[PDB]
Amino acid sequence: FQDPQERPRKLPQLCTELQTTIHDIILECVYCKQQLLRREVYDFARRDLCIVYRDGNPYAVCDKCLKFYSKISEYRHYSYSLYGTTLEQQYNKPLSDLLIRCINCQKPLSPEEKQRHLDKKQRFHNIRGRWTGRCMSCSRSS
């Protein structure tokens, strides 16, 4: 996997290339190098994350390492916050048309999660150009 203009970018294309399924693929975390649990493989795909190549090998990320680094990033690279309505007015699009990832797990927020923010009067955070919120699972426990 030499050039990035060829090698599979996301998990579904990687499965296709190896001629395997998401139920069978063996992946390791880019950080800790521990093999991902089957549930973590599914979460990597749900989070719409990119496969990261190191020394010509594909790597994913485990749940614990992703949350660890996502927290350090928010801490250091937080820019500013807006209420959902102000964000909609800024880009002249409903929240459903914007890419808002969970600040903790990176999962792109569902329309229901974006609506919870509006109802609960919870702000969205800008992390150096990236808009973030909080998913249902991370709203329970991060």
Binding site: V30, C50, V61, L66, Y69, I72, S79, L99, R128, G129
Partner: protein, 382 residues
């Protein structure tokens, strides 16, 4: 929405509350176009926030390192100077404002940290870092200290850390290699060990920041400080008989400070891009324009060849240039934010004595690389 037929400029207040405004007044007299100079708080942070919505100033003045990140976010207009205009400014200043093969700002002035010394306490400043502990023992007996400078910002501690071999990102084949960080190496370890030993031997204090160092030097309590041209004006007011010189050597090698280029970027959302190029090229970047700004607050070593030659006779500007030539241009790549925070933490952790220098630097290279890996996991989509 930015207002058409007018120019709004953002510059830091310590670059002059009169100088640039005066150039703006000459532009208004000639064109009829109103020029408004503003000094917002945290303008380098306010700019990427407002400009992302198609708002903000027409022109932004800041150090070049932040410009790569603004250009990556599509916030800056590509600048189009003709060959004859490009010729009036030094090539390395144009290199500092080049992002992904395009010019993204106009270079104004070149800055680097220098060794600032009190001529009354210290007529001959030390040429080496290694002689500073012996100098401190002599001065402590007189109720003074040898050196006091900001230890909080990695920009200030870098001259010494980089001296024997440290670097931010490797530059080869006209490109920065984001995987080649030079924090965890023998050079950076030697420099930081010397810095931390100064703190351990009580020649410096880990809590020393900008304000503490400035007050100490300007009150004649410390024989030396490390600062840039933005600090000279307060030293002038203090009436301290000061000298600005070459930074001390470490292990026989010169201190490698970062080199900053004050730059003027045109907002990509501005409807006044032609007015902006006109003002920057034909009003500001002239001997007359830079003199109006410089007489208010010194810029350092100007990018404009003609005026730099005229100012070079100031020994403080000659020291700024000598240090900049021995220095390292700050990379303008957005990946620099990963570097800055990792190094900042390393210095704090090592200086506290809660971790060894080597372990702190190893953690800094791991941490900077980890932030960049996270960005790669997320992708460029926003």
């Amino acid at each position: 929405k930015i207002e058409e037929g007018k120019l709004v400029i953002w510059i830091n207040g310590d670059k002059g509350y009169n100088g640039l405004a005066e150039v703006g007044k000459k532009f208004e007299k000639d064109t009829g176009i109103k020029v408004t100079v503003e000094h917002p708080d945290k303008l380098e942070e306010k700019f990427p926030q407002v400009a992302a919505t198609g708002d903000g100033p027409d022109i932004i003045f800041w150090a070049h390192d932040r410009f790569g990140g603004y250009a990556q976010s599509g916030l800056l207009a590509e600048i189009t100077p003709a060959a004859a205009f490009q010729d009036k400014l030094y090539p390395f200043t144009w290199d500092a404002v080049r992002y992904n093969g395009k010019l993204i700002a106009y270079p104004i002035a070149v800055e680097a940290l220098s060794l600032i010394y009190n001529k009354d306490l210290l007529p001959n400043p030390p040429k080496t870092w290694e002689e500073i502990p012996a100098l401190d023992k002599e001065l402590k007996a007189k109720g003074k200290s040898a050196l006091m400078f900001n230890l909080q910002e990695p920009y200030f501690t870098w001259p010494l850390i980089a001296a024997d071999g440290g670097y931010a990102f490797k530059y080869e084949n006209g490109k920065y290699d984001i995987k080649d960080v030079g924090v965890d190496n023998a050079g950076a370890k030697a420099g930081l060990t010397f810095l931390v030993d100064l703190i351990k031997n009580k020649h410096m204090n880990a809590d020393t920041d900008y304000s503490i160092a400035e007050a100490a030097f300007n009150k004649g309590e410390t024989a030396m400080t490390i600062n840039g041209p933005w600090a000279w004006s307060n030293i002038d007011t203090s009436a301290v008989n000061y000298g600005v010189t070459v930074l001390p050597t470490f292990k026989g090698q010169p201190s490698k400070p970062f080199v900053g280029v004050l730059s003027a970027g045109i907002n990509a959302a501005s409807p006044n891009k032609e007015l902006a190029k006109e003002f920057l090229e034909n009003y500001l970047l002239t001997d007359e324009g830079l003199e109006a700004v410089n007489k208010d607050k010194p810029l350092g070593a100007v990018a404009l060849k003609s005026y730099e030659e005229e100012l070079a006779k100031d020994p403080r500007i000659a020291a700024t240039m000598e240090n900049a030539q021995k220095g390292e241009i700050m990379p303008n790549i957005p990946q620099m934010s990963a570097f800055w925070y990792a190094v900042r933490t390393a210095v704090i952790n090592a200086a506290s004595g809660r971790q060894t220098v080597d372990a702190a630097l190893a953690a800094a290279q791991t941490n900077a690389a980890a932030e960049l890996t996270l960005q790669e996991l997320l992708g460029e989509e926003r």
